[PDB]
Design a protein around this ligand. Sequence first.
Ligand code: A1AP7
Ligand code: W3S
Ligand code: CL
Ligand code: CL
Length: 163
Amino acid sequence: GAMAPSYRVKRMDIAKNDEECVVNAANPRGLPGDGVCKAVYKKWPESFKNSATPVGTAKTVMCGTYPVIHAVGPNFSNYTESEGDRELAAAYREVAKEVTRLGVNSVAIPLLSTGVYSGGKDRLTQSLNHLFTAMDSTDADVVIYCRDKEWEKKISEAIQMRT
Ligand SMILES: Cc1cn[nH]c1-c1ccncc1
Ligand SMILES: Nc1nnc2ccccn12
Ligand SMILES: [Cl-]
Ligand SMILES: [Cl-]
């Protein structure tokens, strides 16, 4: 575990993380995809061997010794707000199980279902709160990645509100 388990936020490409493993915002089919998924495919293509997994699950595939945790959030274009919310919570619970199983001391995580799976809505708070619910009981250092300046400020404020 980390000496003093913490949350941090960074505004940068998650493919350039400084953590011991990465969470991919994957599609259920293990395709190169778009956004975070495409950056992860370019950096760790070997990790897409048999990476297909259902919505609300996470599947880890090694790239060398570096673990890529493929976490499949719901596409809110297809799911109801209610069913989507349950699958988004479930994906993060499966990420916490994988991070714990791997024994890493740090993990790089994106906000699942906030990009092309958002159904055209702002889901910063919804996604972040499900991330906290899952990861609060883990002792890895969690570094949350984002691309927008206003998202960085809102994520940083949410972390500080708890400390
Ligand atoms: C689209 C992309 C590529 N590398 N990282 C991201 C990213 C990270 C966090 N939040 C949104 C996007
Ligand atoms: N996850 C994330 N980071 N920055 C942004 C901006 C818009 C939508 C989602 N975002
Ligand atoms: Cl960057
Ligand atoms: Cl997304």
